[PDB]
Amino acid sequence: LAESVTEVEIFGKATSIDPNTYITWIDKYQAQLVVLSAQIAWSENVETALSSMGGGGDAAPLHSVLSNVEV
């Protein structure tokens, strides 16, 4: 879980993910672990975006998180 989270942080905090490296990461770790790493990365990204959004809607990274999820 530690290693998969380490890789999935690099995956999440990026745009236009290369399918080859993503598929290699998926194959490397177990299904349970892949899903758990995705959940951890998304939760931490949303928490960071909300913390940076303390003032309000100004400089919203939530749109960036949604864009990464769509990608």
From Swiss-Prot:
> Localized where?
Cytoplasm, Cytoskeleton
State the superkingdom: Eukaryota
What family is reported?
Answer: Belongs to the dynein heavy chain family.
Domain free text: Dynein heavy chains probably consist of an N-terminal stem (which binds cargo and interacts with other dynein components), and the head or motor domain. The motor contains six tandemly-linked AAA domains in the head, which form a ring. A stalk-like structure (formed by two of the coiled coil domains) protrudes between AAA 4 and AAA 5 and terminates in a microtubule-binding site. A seventh domain may also contribute to this ring; it is not clear whether the N-terminus or the C-terminus forms this extra domain.
Instruction: Tell me, in a sentence or two, what this protein's role is.
Output: Cytoplasmic dynein 1 acts as a motor for the intracellular retrograde motility of vesicles and organelles along microtubules. Dynein has ATPase activity; the force-producing power stroke is thought to occur on release of ADP. Plays a role in mitotic spindle assembly and metaphase plate congression.
In the UniProt entry, the disease listed is:
Charcot-Marie-Tooth disease, axonal, type 2O: An axonal form of Charcot-Marie-Tooth disease, a disorder of the peripheral nervous system, characterized by progressive weakness and atrophy, initially of the peroneal muscles and later of the distal muscles of the arms. Charcot-Marie-Tooth disease is classified in two main groups on the basis of electrophysiologic properties and histopathology: primary peripheral demyelinating neuropathies (designated CMT1 when they are dominantly inherited) and primary peripheral axonal neuropathies (CMT2). Cortical dysplasia, complex, with other brain malformations 13: An autosomal dominant disorder characterized by global developmental delay with impaired intellectual development. Some patients show signs of peripheral neuropathy, such as abnormal gait and hyporeflexia. CDCBM13 is associated with variable neuronal migration defects resulting in cortical malformations.
Subunit comment: Homodimer. The cytoplasmic dynein 1 complex consists of two catalytic heavy chains (HCs) and a number of non-catalytic subunits presented by intermediate chains (ICs), light intermediate chains (LICs) and light chains (LCs); the composition seems to vary in respect to the IC, LIC and LC composition. The heavy chain homodimer serves as a scaffold for the probable homodimeric assembly of the respective non-catalytic subunits. The ICs and LICs bind directly to the HC dimer and dynein LCs assemble on the IC dimer. Interacts with DYNC1LI1; DYNC1LI1 and DYNC1LI2 bind mutually exclusive to DYNC1H1.
* Name of the protein this chain belongs to: Cytoplasmic dynein 1 heavy chain 1
Protein's organism: Homo sapiens
